[PDB]
Every structure is written in C-alpha cells, then in structure tokens.
Amino acid sequence: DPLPFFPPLYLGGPEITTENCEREPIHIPGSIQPHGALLTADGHSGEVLQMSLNAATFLGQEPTVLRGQTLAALLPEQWPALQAALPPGCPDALQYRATLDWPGHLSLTVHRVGELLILEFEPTEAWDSTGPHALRNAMFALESAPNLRALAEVATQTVRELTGFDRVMLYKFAPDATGEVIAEARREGLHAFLGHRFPASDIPAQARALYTRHLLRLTADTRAAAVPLDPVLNPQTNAPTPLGGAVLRATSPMHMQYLRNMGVGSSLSVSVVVGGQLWGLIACHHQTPYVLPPDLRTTLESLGRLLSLQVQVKEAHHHHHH
Amino acid sequence: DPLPFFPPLYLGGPEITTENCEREPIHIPGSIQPHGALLTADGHSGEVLQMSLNAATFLGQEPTVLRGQTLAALLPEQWPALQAALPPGCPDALQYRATLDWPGHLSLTVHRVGELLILEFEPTEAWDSTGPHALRNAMFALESAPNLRALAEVATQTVRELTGFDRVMLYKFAPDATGEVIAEARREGLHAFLGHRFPASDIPAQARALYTRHLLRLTADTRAAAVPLDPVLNPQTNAPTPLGGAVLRATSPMHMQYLRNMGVGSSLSVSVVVGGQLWGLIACHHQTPYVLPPDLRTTLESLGRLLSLQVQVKEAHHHHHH
Numbered sequence: 176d177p178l179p180f181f182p183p184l185y186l187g188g189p190e191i192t193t194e195n196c197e198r199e200p201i202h203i204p205g206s207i208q209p210h211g212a213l214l215t216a217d218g219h220s221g222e223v224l225q226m227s228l229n230a231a232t233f234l235g236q237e238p239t240v241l242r243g244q245t246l247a248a249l250l251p252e253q254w255p256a257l258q259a260a261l262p263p264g265c266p267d268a269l270q271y272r273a274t275l276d277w278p279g280h281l282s283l284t285v286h287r288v289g290e291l292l293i294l295e296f297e298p299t300e301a302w303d304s305t306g307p308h309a310l311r312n313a314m315f316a317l318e319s320a321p322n323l324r325a326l327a328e329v330a331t332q333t334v335r336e337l338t339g340f341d342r343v344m345l346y347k348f349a350p351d352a353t354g355e356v357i358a359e360a361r362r363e364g365l366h367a368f369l370g371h372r373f374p375a376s377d378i379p380a381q382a383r384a385l386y387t388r389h390l391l392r393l394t395a396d397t398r399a400a401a402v403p404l405d406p407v408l409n410p411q412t413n414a415p416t417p418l419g420g421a422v423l424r425a426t427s428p429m430h431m432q433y434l435r436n437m438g439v440g441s442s443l444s445v446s447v448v449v450g451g452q453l454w455g456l457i458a459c460h461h462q463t464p465y466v467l468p469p470d471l472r473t474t475l476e477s478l479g480r481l482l483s484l485q486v487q488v489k490e491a492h493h494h495h496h497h
Numbered sequence: 498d499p500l501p502f503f504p505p506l507y508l509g510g511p512e513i514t515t516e517n518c519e520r521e522p523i524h525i526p527g528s529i530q531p532h533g534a535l536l537t538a539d540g541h542s543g544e545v546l547q548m549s550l551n552a553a554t555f556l557g558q559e560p561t562v563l564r565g566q567t568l569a570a571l572l573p574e575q576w577p578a579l580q581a582a583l584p585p586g587c588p589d590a591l592q593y594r595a596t597l598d599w600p601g602h603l604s605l606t607v608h609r610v611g612e613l614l615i616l617e618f619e620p621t622e623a624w625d626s627t628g629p630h631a632l633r634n635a636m637f638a639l640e641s642a643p644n645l646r647a648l649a650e651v652a653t654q655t656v657r658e659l660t661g662f663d664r665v666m667l668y669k670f671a672p673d674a675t676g677e678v679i680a681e682a683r684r685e686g687l688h689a690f691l692g693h694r695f696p697a698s699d700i701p702a703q704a705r706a707l708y709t710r711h712l713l714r715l716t717a718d719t720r721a722a723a724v725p726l727d728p729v730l731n732p733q734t735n736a737p738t739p740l741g742g743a744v745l746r747a748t749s750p751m752h753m754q755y756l757r758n759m760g761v762g763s764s765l766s767v768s769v770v771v772g773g774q775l776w777g778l779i780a781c782h783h784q785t786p787y788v789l790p791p792d793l794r795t796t797l798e799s800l801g802r803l804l805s806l807q808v809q810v811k812e813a814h815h816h817h818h819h
C-alpha cells in the first residue's frame with residue numbers, strides 16, 4: 176500500500192531525501208539515460224509528440240523536422256507492423272521490437288500506454304544478437320535443481336555465464352519486505368554478499384509496486400547524467416509521460432548514489448513474481464559501465480518468468496508434501 | 498514398460514505390421530529426411546565418420562574429400578566452440594547451434610551421444626530468424642488463463658499464430674494411454690477433431706518413451722523418401738547410430754502412412770512433460786509440405802517446457818485446493 180506520490184521536480188515537487196523517499200514518483204522522471212533516444216507518438220495518427228533532447232545524435236536529424244512528423248513518414252515499413260502488434264487497450268508490458276538499418280544498427284522497442292506509443296532507440300552490433308538456444312539450454316540446469324536453495328544457486332550461476340556480469344545475486348523478500356541474499360555468483364576476488372540481510376527501505380514500497388508490473392530495469396552508467404524529454408509533459412493529456420515500461424527511463428538519483436557508494440558502475444535486475452506477489456529479484460552488478468544488448472535483456476526477462484514458475488512449483492510441492 | 502526392439506531393417510529385422518509395431522526401433526532408422534544433411538564425427542578427434550548420401554548437395558563437396566576429414570579442417574571457427582559447448586558426458590538433449598555462410602545460409606545443429614557428435618545442416622533464409630520476443634510476448638497469454646481447459650485453448654491459438662500451421666491440437670493422454678483432443682485451433686473450413694478420443698496404439702509405447710526424453714519431432718513432407726547414412730553403422734561401435742535427438746531422423750513408415758491417410762502434408766509435435774511423465778502433445782498439421790525454420794522450432798520447444806510448468810502449477814493448485 177504505497178503512499179501517494181509527490182509531484183515530480185519539473186512540476187515543483189520537493190527534493191527527495193532519506194525522510195521522504197517513499198514518495199518519489201520514480202515512474203515519471205521526464206528524462207532518459209543517454210545511451211539511447213526516446214520518442215513518443217500519438218497511437219492513432221503516429222504524430223511525433225515528444226522527443227529526448229539527444230534524438231538528433233541517434234536519428235541523424237534535428238528535432239525541427241522530427242516533431243509533428245508522422246511515423247508513417249519516418250518508419251514506413253515498421254509503422255503498419257507497429258499498429259498491428261500494439262492495438263488499443265493492450266497491456267503496457269507488451270512490446271514490439273525491430274532492428275533498423277540507419278544511415279548503424281538501431282534496435283527499436285515500442286510499447287503502448289493509453290493512447291501513446293513510446294519508442295526507444297539504441298545502438299546495437301550485428302554480433303549482439305542472441306538466439307532462442309540461450310534460454311532453451313539454460314532450462315535444463317534449472318529443472319534438475321532438487322530444492323529451492325539449489326534452484327537459487329544454479330540460477331545465479333546461469334545468469335552470470337550468459338551475461339558476464341561481475342556479480343549476480345538472488346535477493347529474496349521476507350514478509351516484512353526486508354531482504355536476504357540467498358544465492359550469489361561473483362568474480363574471483365570480490366567480497367561476498369551471500370547471507371547478508373538488508374532493510375526494507377533500500378527498495379521502497381513504490382519501487383516494489385512498479386517492479387511487480389514491469390519486470391526489468393537497469394542503470395547502464397551510474398555516473399551518467401539523464402537527458403530531458405521535450406516537451407516534458409504529454410501534449411495529449413497535459414500530464415507527465417508514464418515511463419515505467421521504458422528501460423531507458425532515468426533511474427532515481429537516490430538509487431544512483433547508493434550504487435556509486437557500493438563501487439558499482441552498471442546495474443540491472445529482473446523481478447521474480449510469484450502469485451502476483453514480488454518474491455525476489457535477480458540482481459546484477461558490473462564494475463564499469465555496460466549496456467547489455469536488447470536480445471540478451473529479453474532472454475533474462477524470460478528466464479525470470481521461468482524461475483517464477485519453478486519457485487511456485489517447489490513451494491507448492493514442499494507445502495503440499497506437509 | 499516398452500517391449501524390446503526388433504533389429505532394424507538393415508540388420509535383418511522383420512517388416513513392421515500392425516501386429517508388431519510396438520517393437521519398431523524408431524530411434525535407429527539409419528536414414529534422414531531429404532531437406533537437410535547429416536554428418537557424424539568422433540567427439541575427440543573430430544574425424545568425420547558417417548554422412549548422409551545427399552551431403553554433397555548441401556555441402557558442395559563429394560564424400561571422397563569429406564569422410565575421414567576432421568571438423569578442424571571443415572569448420573575451423575565452429576570447431577573450438579562446438580567442443581566447449583558439448584563436453585563429454587553432457588546430456589544428449591543439449592544442443593549447439595550456428596548459422597553458416599556457405600559458398601547460401603546453412604543452419605547447423607549439433608548434439609552429443611556418448612563419444613559421437615551428430616551434425617545436422619539445413620538451408621535457412623535471412624528472414625527466417627526469430628527473436629526472443631516471440632516467446633516473451635506469448636507468455637502473457639498463457640499466464641492469464643483461469644483453468645486448465647482455458648490454458649489448453651489459448652496455447653493452441655498461440656502456437657497457430659506463431660507458425661501458421663493449418664491445425665494445432667492439444668492432445669492429452671489418459672491413465673491408460675488413450676488420448677483426447679482437449680483443445681484445437683484450425684483453419685476455417687477444416688473439420689474439427691475437438692473432443693475426439695483415440696486408442697493408445699496410435700502412439701505406441703516406445704514412441705511415448707522416446708518423446709519423454711527428446712521433446713520435438715517432425716515430418717516435413719509426408720511423401721518424401723528417406724536418405725541413407727553411409728556407412729550405416731557407427732564405426733566407433735559397429736552398432737546403429739542413435740538418432741532420437743536429431744530432428745532430421747527419418748519418420749516411422751507406419752506413421753507416414755497414417756499421416757497420408759489423414760490428408761496431412763507436414764506434421765510436427767512438441768512433448769508436454771509433467772513430473773517426468775508424458776502428459777500430452779502439442780500436435781500440428783499442414784496440408785502441404787512445410788519446413789518450420791530452426792529458430793521457430795526452438796521457440797516451440799521452449800513454449801512446451803513453459804506449458805508443462807503452467808500445467809503443473811494448475812494441477813498442483815486445483816489438487817491442493819481440494
């Protein structure tokens with residue numbers, strides 16, 4: 176039951192401190208991480224409504240010829256497919272993805288919130304692709320684990336092999352929202368977090384709520400400044416643009432400072448949701464900035480949903496055995 | 498508890514009839530389907546030991562310069578990766594896959610059985626690739642189904658949308674190994690199989706056993722003649738080559754005739770395995786020959802494993818509710 180949100184900073188809201196941080200509106204920061212570009216567009220006309228200020232870098236055109244243009248003119252072969260994939264009223268977690276050939280390779284991810292389309296562009300390399308075999312072969316390791324703790328251990332090992340992150344943890348929530356690191360895979364030489372417990376305030380209630388609905392989030396560079404959207408309010412509504420479903424969403428500054436204090440250069444986590452409840456997180460750290468490729472991110476998200484069912488079977492089974 | 502196998506035809510075994518078909522050694526036919534090529538190689542040296550007779554068509558070289566050559570000479574950039582992915586003693590269901598650029602596009606799938614590597618080559622198109630989003634977006638439909646029958650219905654619909662097959666069924670086994678079509682998605686105009694029940698003999702006991710360990714099999718063209726391996730016995734062992742893990746494995750002639758009698762041009766199914774037991778099949782038909790691309794096959798296999806956990810949760814839940 177999260178408390179109501181403060182207005183965001185660009186609407187005159189208060190500065191966030193350790194006394195009020197449960198009220199930070201982390202889903203509407205009005206800004207993005209600088210390794211990609213974001214546009215929003217009207218879901219019926221395709222008119223481009225908002226754009227991140229760095230969009231000319233990634234899209235090779237100044238906003239003058241971008242704002243107010245339609246996606247039918249900018250993305251003529253993707254526009255019909257985009258409409259078919261994200262019809263009105265669809266879930267905001269549903270996504271459309273394409274790989275564009277831009278005068279290099281741009282990855283395009285789209286989702287729909289109400290009557291708005293949110294388009295994320297980020298550079299990708301030809302060798303950055305990941306086939307379905309990555310997930311397929313990983314399912315064998317997970318199904319042979321004999322109990323819940325063994326399942327957690329093999330899961331962290333599997334995620335570290337797929338990604339190369341310096342540290343991968345399984346963080347389990349207790350009934351009071353405190354957490355414990357119940358499994359960990361880490362680079363040789365890094366100190367262990369295995370078995371450590373943390374207070375509920377390190378992941379506040381409005382973050383836990385968001386993480387029950389949008390399953391993956393990341394900070395690619397913990398010392399990068401965010402890039403504003405322009406205009407900052409959605410012209411359709413005269414209200415903030417919901418970015419909870421955008422991986423390019425700017426991270427809370429409170430969390431960015433937390434990560435820097437830990438010596439973390441890049442961070443990523445995936446929700447494990449069991450029976451509609453946030454059960455835990457697959458939590459990853461790198462010592463330097465690192466952008467995990469889009470195909471590998473989607474694989475990790477799918478692995479999280481698999482792990483959720485495996486947890487739910489084991490918990491059901493060792494509850495039914497009693 | 499399947500009865501012991503007859504020797505295969507090329508070892509002097511008897512002809513298979515409706516009186517003895519539970520003894521057909523379907524895993525060692527000594528032949529493959531003609532839309533791809535197969536090689537076997539020593540798992541340590543990489544020496545090429547057996548090849549399908551059509552291999553020169555797909556590999557552009559006569560067997561004279563193929564047999565006895567090493568994979569280090571033929572596939573110099575794949576050979577080291579192949580060894581790392583399939584170490585001695587690994588599961589025979591574990592697979593390695595690459596996309597080769599051949600003087601067009603060849604898909605390469607490798608698995609290991611004992612000390613033998615089995616390599617399958619098949620042509621593929623650049624537009625035949627399937628990203629991880631296909632499986633990711635399909636998971637949403639499956640998790641919202643309220644009960645087991647609804648889960649079956651949405652699953653068949655999802656598989657038909659991904660593949661375009663004329664008919665997709667969910668076939669559930671009863672405790673006596675008879676089966677029932679409990680859900681079906683089909684092209685407009687095709688008669689329904691929904692609700693029909695079939696005898697246990699249509700999928701005999703040795704097929705059910707094989708299908709508990711190797712989860713996907715297909716017949717791309719129900720009127721295509723199979724292509725022999727040469728030599729037909731594995732020189733390592735002087736014994737038949739196990740092909741249960743090869744999708745190119747020739748289909749039982751008894752089943753090929755069954756399919757032709759039904760008017761089926763192409764067939765494919767995926768096992769649903771629950772608690773180590775064969776629970777049912779996702780069974781697909783096309784009216785004409787059709788080779789589903791390798792990336793889409795692996796996606797269907799992963800969807801089958803997902804469905805198995807969803808079935809196991811629902812059955813556990815509505816057994817626990819009682």
Ligand SMILES: *C/C=C1/C(=C/c2[nH]c(/C=C3[NH+]=C(/C=C4\NC(=O)C(C=C)=C4C)C(C)=C\3CCC(=O)O)c(CCC(=O)O)c2C)NC(=O)[C@H]1C
Pocket residue numbers: 192193194195196197199201354368373376377378379382392393394425426427429430433442443444456458459
């Ligand atoms: C007063 C507010 C505070 C606060 C806010 C906050 N924290 C997050 C997100 C996360 N916190 C995490 C905690 C940990 N990471 C670790 O490595 C460990 C132990 C080794 C802990 C306990 C995690 C994993 C997240 C999720 C994000 C990620 O994976 O990096 C947010 C939300 C960030 C966002 O999504 O924008 C917020 C607002 N944390 C505090 O400690 C207090 C000061």
Ligand SMILES: *C/C=C1/C(=C/c2[nH]c(/C=C3[NH+]=C(/C=C4\NC(=O)C(C=C)=C4C)C(C)=C\3CCC(=O)O)c(CCC(=O)O)c2C)NC(=O)[C@H]1C
Pocket residue numbers: 514515516517518519521523676690695698699700701704714715716747748749751752755764765766778780781
């Ligand atoms: C005397 C032996 C017989 C026999 C053998 C046999 N059958 C299979 C495999 C399958 N049979 C299937 C049955 C059905 N397909 C349908 O569409 C329906 C109802 C609409 C049924 C009952 C299926 C689905 C399979 C799996 C393969 C596939 O998906 O096409 C085998 C094994 C084939 C192989 O893997 O090599 C064998 C040996 N079937 C008989 O009816 C008797 C005559």
Ligand SMILES: [Cl-]
Pocket residue numbers: 197375376378379380381
């Ligand atoms: Cl809080």
Ligand SMILES: [Cl-]
Pocket residue numbers: 494495497
């Ligand atoms: Cl109970």
Ligand SMILES: [Cl-]
Pocket residue numbers: 519697698700701702703
């Ligand atoms: Cl039988």
Ligand SMILES: [Cl-]
Pocket residue numbers: 816817819
């Ligand atoms: Cl009970």
Ligand code: NI
Pocket residue numbers: 495816
């Ligand atoms: Ni019971």
Ligand code: NI
Pocket residue numbers: 494817
């Ligand atoms: Ni109970």
